Amino acid sequence: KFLVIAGPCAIESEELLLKVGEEIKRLSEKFKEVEFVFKSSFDKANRSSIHSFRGHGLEYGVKALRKVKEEFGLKITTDIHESWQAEPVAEVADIIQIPAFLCRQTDLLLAAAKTGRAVNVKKGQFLAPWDTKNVVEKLKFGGAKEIYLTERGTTFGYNNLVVDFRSLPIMKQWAKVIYDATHSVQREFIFPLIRAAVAVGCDGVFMETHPEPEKALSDASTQLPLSQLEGIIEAILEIREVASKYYETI
Template identity: 45%
Template sequence: MIPAYLTELFKHQQYDSNNFFLIAGPCVVESEELVMEVGDTVSRICADLGIPYVFKASYRKANRTSASSFTGIGDDNGLSLIKKVGETYQLPTTSDIHAHDEAAMAAPFIDILQIPAFLCRQTDLLMAAAETGKVVNVKKGQFLSGQSMKFAVDKIKLAGNQQIMLTERGTTFGYQDLVVDYRNIPWMQEHGCPVIMDCTHSLQQPNQTSGVTGGNPQLIGTIAKAAIAAGADGLFIETHPNPSVAKSDGANMLKLDLLKPLLEQLVKLRKAV
């Protein structure tokens, strides 16, 4: 079920209330042309399939392997473009924040504040996000179990916010790989929150000696189908018209023209489940 605080965000969209919801967009705001193209394309696909849709893009990438990696076009520019996509296509929007003082800065521009996995234990960040009154989506740390995410949920509730989502994004396996433990989906749902499967970051191969994170995008469909079968409430998929030239996470993003056929399969699977 989609909770009331999300149905309010989806009020401008026509969708099947029994469907999963989708969070999708490019990894980072590279340009106005990119975010508008992705927002337009994905919103049309989701409208056709009855999928409630949240546009996602990072206004800044703070967690990069190399100090020379692209981080964004500036906070104000990035946030303004995310807001423009939301207003143009009447979509809720989300982006990640990295420090407690970013919460109040980003909140006027976006509807859902996303907490990166590496920062899911940062008490001041969680509580600052909660205090904005926005929906807070916390990505499960690659080093944590689903059960232990209870403490992140408790911190947000302690700050007076009940609007919480949790995202599974894989667990560290060795030094340069991740695996998905699908038990975490029902385990995190026990905390009373909708649970999202991050189908792209869970396929990352981090810490490459080249300084650029690798990935296995050919398995995005596998991760997504298994998540729907396991009862995930939503899916998170980063997508780009041409991942090979993307300025961040190109190695694990889904090519934009592959999104519709995948979503068509997932909608059928959801109905079967």
């Protein structure tokens, strides 16, 4: 089925996670035609500024996420930043996410693959679509069986990312493809591009959502308001239903 990965960018508090998890659980029950995966980062390890919010740490985060899966029975996904974090994270995370800047770090990929969990690699803004083939190979060599590649834009001049949708069919040759709707534009362009992603064809969409994005401690300018999530999901399912007839074979 279609994958929808969503949740607040960072684990600002297990309290926030529960409120978001409650809504994702509701959509989960409303759209049985979709596999929902709850996402949130226990640490923003690559902020530009040293004086920015990073999080409450790995232990606090894993505990908060554990709570979401127990209170709602939702699959979990979070990102790791160094090899040693794979094991403890794999205790809760159904899908281990690899940050875009780290998509070429062999040991991180191998560490994630060793946990036996699914692995989702964010395509580096510096990577060409065809160069993700080697990323998948690393994961397969490492013992990974469920592999995802996420489109999140490519470097286009300075301080700008462009989404080359030709990447979707190219990456589909060796892995399931997820379109990251919120980081690919980093709000007026979020919906239009997600619509494009599903018209082109992908296996899922990734989107950060927060009750009050403006009050968020991370990606306050791109996180989707929680209340708009249902409408966008219904919209992409309808578009996908009609467009899927034309998705090119492999």
